[PDB]
């Protein structure tokens, strides 16, 4: 009986794998978005200050 | 960016033994994304033209460059992945809901059996037939041993 109950508790906690998949996907796409932001920002400022420096 | 609360070895209790590497690989990737988002801020620090208009000697190049900047659409990434894992999770919820239902049937089946074994008449009243009914392992095999004593003489 107690083994059955423990199995029930584990299979209750089951959903963490799926929500971790969720978290990883969300974080990955957010990181990519902010990386694009900084890519374009950095490079246009690079062109601008290239002109300034020359 | 909304995130979900997470315990970690609570996530390892539920992971089967066929995909441990996959599991803690996703764990490592999670940590990579933790530190990486924690590092850089949300938005880039916008830039002032006064330092860029009073400096560049080119004709309006500051203004049109930064106009293209302030008139630029950066491609927002799209999920295309949370829905499928959400549906997978729903399906698994179904599967293990029915698993636990079956095992609840088994719970109270076991508890019925335990109430039976708890309601056994004292042994000094029990006949060999009743002991056999309450411990069916003691039933002498009248097929592999059809003749008295109905068991191997070593156990006899």
From Swiss-Prot, chain A:
It comes from the Eukaryota. Coiled coil: none annotated. It is found in: Mitochondrion; Mitochondrion inner membrane. The modification N6-acetyllysine is found at residues 5, 13. Subunit b, of the mitochondrial membrane ATP synthase complex (F(1)F(0) ATP synthase or Complex V) that produces ATP from ADP in the presence of a proton gradient across the membrane which is generated by electron transport complexes of the respiratory chain. ATP synthase complex consist of a soluble F(1) head domain - the catalytic core - and a membrane F(1) domain - the membrane proton channel. These two domains are linked by a central stalk rotating inside the F(1) region and a stationary peripheral stalk. Component of the ATP synthase complex composed at least of ATP5F1A/subunit alpha, ATP5F1B/subunit beta, ATP5MC1/subunit c (homooctomer), MT-ATP6/subunit a, MT-ATP8/subunit 8, ATP5ME/subunit e, ATP5MF/subunit f, ATP5MG/subunit g, ATP5MK/subunit k, ATP5MJ/subunit j, ATP5F1C/subunit gamma, ATP5F1D/subunit delta, ATP5F1E/subunit epsilon, ATP5PF/subunit F6, ATP5PB/subunit b, ATP5PD/subunit d, ATP5PO/subunit OSCP. Belongs to the eukaryotic ATPase B chain family. This is ATP synthase peripheral stalk subunit b, mitochondrial. The chain holds residues 150 to 203 of 256 of the full protein.
From Swiss-Prot, chain B:
PANTHER family: ATP SYNTHASE SUBUNIT D, MITOCHONDRIAL. Keywords: Acetylation, CF(0), Hydrogen ion transport, Ion transport, Membrane, Mitochondrion, Mitochondrion inner membrane, Transport. The keyword Transport applies. The gene is ATP5PD. Component of the ATP synthase complex composed at least of ATP5F1A/subunit alpha, ATP5F1B/subunit beta, ATP5MC1/subunit c (homooctomer), MT-ATP6/subunit a, MT-ATP8/subunit 8, ATP5ME/subunit e, ATP5MF/subunit f, ATP5MG/subunit g, ATP5MK/subunit k, ATP5MJ/subunit j, ATP5F1C/subunit gamma, ATP5F1D/subunit delta, ATP5F1E/subunit epsilon, ATP5PF/subunit F6, ATP5PB/subunit b, ATP5PD/subunit d, ATP5PO/subunit OSCP. Subunit d, of the mitochondrial membrane ATP synthase complex (F(1)F(0) ATP synthase or Complex V) that produces ATP from ADP in the presence of a proton gradient across the membrane which is generated by electron transport complexes of the respiratory chain. ATP synthase complex consist of a soluble F(1) head domain - the catalytic core - and a membrane F(1) domain - the membrane proton channel. These two domains are linked by a central stalk rotating inside the F(1) region and a stationary peripheral stalk. This is ATP synthase peripheral stalk subunit d, mitochondrial. One of its GO terms (cellular component) is proton-transporting ATP synthase complex.
